[PDB]
Amino acid sequence: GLLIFKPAFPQELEFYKAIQGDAPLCSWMPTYLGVLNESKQYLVLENLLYGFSKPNILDIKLGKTLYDSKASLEKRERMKRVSETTTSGSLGFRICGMKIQKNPSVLNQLSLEYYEEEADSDYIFINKLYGRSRTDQNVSDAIELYFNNPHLSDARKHQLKKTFLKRLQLFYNTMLEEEVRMISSSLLFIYEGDPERWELLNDVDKLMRDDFIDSLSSMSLIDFAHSEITPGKGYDENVIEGVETLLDIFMKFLE
Ligand SMILES: Nc1ncnc2c1ncn2[C@@H]1O[C@H](COP(=O)(O)OP(=O)(O)O)[C@@H](O)[C@H]1O
Numbered sequence: 001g002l003l004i005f006k007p008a009f010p011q012e013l014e015f016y017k018a019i020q021g022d023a024p025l026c027s028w029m030p031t032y033l034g035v036l037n038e039s040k041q042y043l044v045l046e047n048l049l050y051g052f053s054k055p056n057i058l059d060i061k062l063g064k065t066l067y068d069s070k071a072s073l074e075k076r077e078r079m080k081r082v083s084e085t086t087t088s089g090s091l092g093f094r095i096c097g098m099k100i101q102k103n104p105s106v107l108n109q110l111s112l113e114y115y116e117e118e119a120d121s122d123y124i125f126i127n128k129l130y131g132r133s134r135t136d137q138n139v140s141d142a143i144e145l146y147f148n149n150p151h152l153s154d155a156r157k158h159q160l161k162k163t164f165l166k167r168l169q170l171f172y173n174t175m176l177e178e179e180v181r182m183i184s185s186s187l188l189f190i191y192e193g194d195p196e197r198w199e200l201l202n203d204v205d206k207l208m209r210d211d212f213i214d215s216l217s218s219m220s221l222i223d224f225a226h227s228e229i230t231p232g233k234g235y236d237e238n239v240i241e242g243v244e245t246l247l248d249i250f251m252k253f254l255e
């Protein structure tokens, strides 16, 4: 699974083409590789999950405002509604979903309408309904749930939280300098749930994701169907606001 095939939306295609001591925006993004014509057209992207034994995945949508310049007013009113009733409008981010290895402990406390299991595997999908129902005050517990892997020590989990704090510091620094407007982009967190792979890598993570063309975890920026480069127009404060709230949350973890 080296490559991912997304259905191409022109705006997202255009954003990847326009982009591709602070780290540059593109170093947070999947490597864009081209298009495939099936016609149906697909973006071909590097698979961020490649090389993980047991990837544990968190999708956080960024921004208070969840509609773009061109949003039809019917769905602009919908996106105001989503923002005002979730942590998006108050914190600048919301949990969109997770795909994680089940901790039996966790599982029992979580209501059945919040996840999908399976007899074929040790994974649960934690759904959008879970993310939308988080409050300002309980969302950080949602993020803790994410890292609460049954296979990892408290030491390794601590290490992971410190690693993403630092990536958040870096991504924040990137964003102060980037002249873009990204509507409904997500941060994608991934971490290795297989302790054998930790041993193989000797608990050594890499702050920045490896170059695909020329990790025990990663944080990436994805989903650019409502994003544009806006040179001269200054930094994306809508997005930065959610990053700032994530920094505060991760600093509380380490306190
Ligand atoms: N490069 C990638 N590698 C691995 N998984 C990806 C990649 N891009 C997207 N995904 C997966 O697809 C999910 C949603 O894709 P997204 O980019 O949000 O699409 P949409 O524009 O349809 O909302 C993410 O939660 C993630 O698990």
Ligand SMILES: [Ca+2]
Residues within 6 Å of the ligand: 199, 200, 201, 202
């Ligand atoms: Ca070893």
Ligand SMILES: [Mn+2]
Residues within 6 Å of the ligand: 184, 186, 223
């Ligand atoms: Mn998305």
